[PDB]
Symmetry: D2
Subunit: 220 residues, 4 copies
């Protein structure tokens, strides 16, 4: 009767505004929570074609999808059926700043995601507005508790055309809806996110992520 | 060049929608101002989301650099942006991790500015001065104005005074963009600010706000 | 207060040693100044490591807030710190990753201030404005003075003017500590600064530097 | 085609100044470069007992000692016998900022390390001046090239007494002495550093580190 099933569906609606450009994006996917793997088909419903690199949105498209070993507390699987929410800031090295929120609920075998994304101050000659990005590099999220709230800090980098990189700092706070969800100790979550396929304007994107929790060296 | 259509006495009309730490709110504003004196006041009314669960002070600079006294030797991007108007986007990075972004579309009709304002903030700690409403006021500040990536940009070291005389630092970056073509870009300059909540009811559902701003070139001709 | 053994005209003696991007240097300075006017000037000479391979400008704020005009309504922590003296520590964080720290231990014998200065910088990119010497000057600035955990702290939004009238941003954080126990701390206030190189030889082995600084309470006051 | 041996000696000399406190610390250790392991006995020679937390110094006490797999360029082992140097900034969340430098050379089977360390603006009641730190948590360094120089950024955290964490951002730049050493692609270096033993005043410290380079998920 556990709330997390081996094979679950993801329903998602994101609405947002980057540099004044409004958009709405729907997502429909599937995933294996215990293997930390998920995939989603995304469709721009409003605001297509997007004038900014689709990659800035992709980590906003659920830490339920992370394989947690036994010795690390799994805050996110413990947050269901009721669910949890997160808030995030993305601080890019050229001054562009985004904030995002996701309210996550569950019914039967399906997670529901109410997503908001806002970005300001991206320069017109920067790699985001020039759509010069190729992918997020693999990353490692550092998970710790601060003021009673599980917090994830990430040194991220977008690979650009030309083999340069473009740095972004992520800070996420995760909050279970129900009281009594046990907070975890310090730990790390490896991430790899990839756009598997897209049409020319990125009005249709298939996205994939793999995530694994561990305790660092030497144990993991 | 360009003539302004800015008048010595103008009206201000403002609607803000936003969301801080997940709480939705809508706030309306109606005020007057003296553009060439750089002074303005506004009556604010929380329409949705009252009583606000966070310190009202974090919103107040989102509540127009038209209201800044510019001397003749510094180009005035803002008065030269009308009648068509301009927009700005802003990040507020607080020292305890709280981050806000805001934007304002400013138009003009007759003697009235219209402001379409959006405000979103995340990651404010539950026991911090913002969610505990321990702020007292913004200290007077100086905005540093310069052209970055072809765009007029204002960077400000800001500080909220807290109860128990302590300060809570916030870093501000704003980009300003005229709607019309051909607006001349200024050289580097400073804008002194002082913003004040003159009065408010107990829950800050109603707030009277005041700002005074003066542009200058720094020492010694300050 | 006015019980100062600070005189209206003071000599300034300085030795800086440092290392930027692996390059060692020693620089001596001899100047004079008017503490109550907030003005000072200095002749600087590179004794070792000349000609410097980085922009001289990054060094110049390390070349004493005694030379700041304080009005009577603001507590003057720096003039009150003498005759014993005070020390400061500083970080300079540049927008392209270059970071500097600096310290100065300031003493006084007779009519002369003595300055033991150290300056270390790391992580300047090979083709950035510092290592390529594209800086023209510091822009005028305003330092924001406040108390944090018992120590007077000054935060500054600084900008180096570059070739082509672009700007290169640096964030300054300084902590100031009187040697004597019990020197009274000021409330929040603002110090305008304008630092300028008045002349130099081609390689900047010899530089004449000037600074004007004035404390104030911001608008609508000063 | 070697230069670097499976077992190598380490000689270190650090001079520095934190909060105005001058200090000199000597190091003598051994390590296995191809296994990414090293141990060092440290001894304060001037400025002891230190008035600040010893932990802030320990990552300044050589990425030679990192296990690099065959599919990733090993910039550090390729830098010898000539050597290389690094510069680092540490930015703590409460305003304390450190810079450090190390000039690494090699004479026979021994590495030599000329280390400098300077720290400023640590609050008198912060965990560093109050010596309230317990250890660095395991970390992951993100390694990428920027303006021709191999750069590593780290989200780091000190565990404190009282079940709390104290966050520090590290940026290091690494420069081979010899011209033309091949730069690597983007990659990640897991770290775990540990004070194994120490006397009461931390005037003698036994330090240990384990480091392993990898390409992130799923390649690890």
């Amino acid at each position: 009767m556990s709330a997390i099933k081996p094979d679950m569906k993801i329903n998602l609606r994101m609405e947002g505004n980057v540099n004044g450009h409004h958009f709405v994006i729907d997502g429909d996917g599937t995933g294996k929570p215990f293997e930390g793997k998920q995939s989603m088909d995304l469709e721009v419903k409003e605001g297509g074609p997007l004038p900014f690199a689709f990659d800035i949105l992709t980590t906003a498209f659920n830490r339920v999808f992370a394989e947690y070993p036994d010795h690390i507390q799994d805050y996110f699987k413990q947050s269901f059926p009721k669910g949890y929410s997160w808030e995030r800031s993305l601080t890019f090295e050229d001054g562009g700043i985004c904030i995002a929120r996701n309210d996550i609920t569950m019914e039967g075998d399906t997670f529901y995601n109410k997503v908001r994304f806002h970005g300001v101050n991206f320069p017109a000659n920067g790699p985001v507005m020039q759509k010069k990005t190729l992918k997020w590099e693999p990353s490692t999220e550092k998970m710790y508790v601060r003021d009673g709230v599980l917090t994830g800090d990430i040194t991220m980098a977008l690979l650009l055309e030309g083999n340069a990189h473009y740095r972004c700092d992520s800070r996420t706070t995760y909050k279970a809806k129900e009281k009594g969800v046990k907070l975890p100790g310090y730990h790390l979550v490896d991430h790899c996110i990839e756009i598997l396929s897209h049409d020319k304007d990125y009005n249709k994107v298939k996205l994939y992520e793999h995530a694994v929790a561990h305790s660092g060296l030497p144990d993991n």
